[PDB]
Amino acid sequence: RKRFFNDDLDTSGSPKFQNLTRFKKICQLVKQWVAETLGDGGPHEKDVKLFVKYLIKLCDSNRVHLVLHLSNLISRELNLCAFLNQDHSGFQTWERILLNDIIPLLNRNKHTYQTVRKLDMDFEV
């Protein structure tokens, strides 16, 4: 399985992905990745890991809404099952990755701190 992304472009304003800063260009690249790997049965494990690292930078820079948009972008592209070939069940494989590697990052960071106040108090007593 070939690599679609270059690991050396990202360090390991909005964070860069694969040397791109414009969000529409990032989205366009992600669209290509999904579309070209469905026919191989899904993406390379390392490209997923590299993309997750970018998504986590988004989460930690108060840009969860950009993770949300990219997630739905990938999700909607998987509606193309009647148009694109898939070997090794690429559509199922991408949907697993979406549900297991990507979507769970939407709740990595909380935006309410009731559990934090509780944890500190439980540790205080």
Q: Rule CB under 8 A: which residues touch a copy of itself? A: 1-4, 13-14, 21-24, 36, 41, 45, 61-66, 68-69, 71-72, 75-76, 78-79, 81-83, 85-86, 88-89, 91-93, 95-96, 98-100, 103-104, 106-107, 110-124
Nearer to a copy of itself, 12 or 82 (CB): 82
CA Rg value for the chain: 17
- Measured from the CB atom, the residue of 23 and 31 that comes closer to a copy of itself is 23
Residue closer to a copy of itself by CB (options 19, 96) is 96
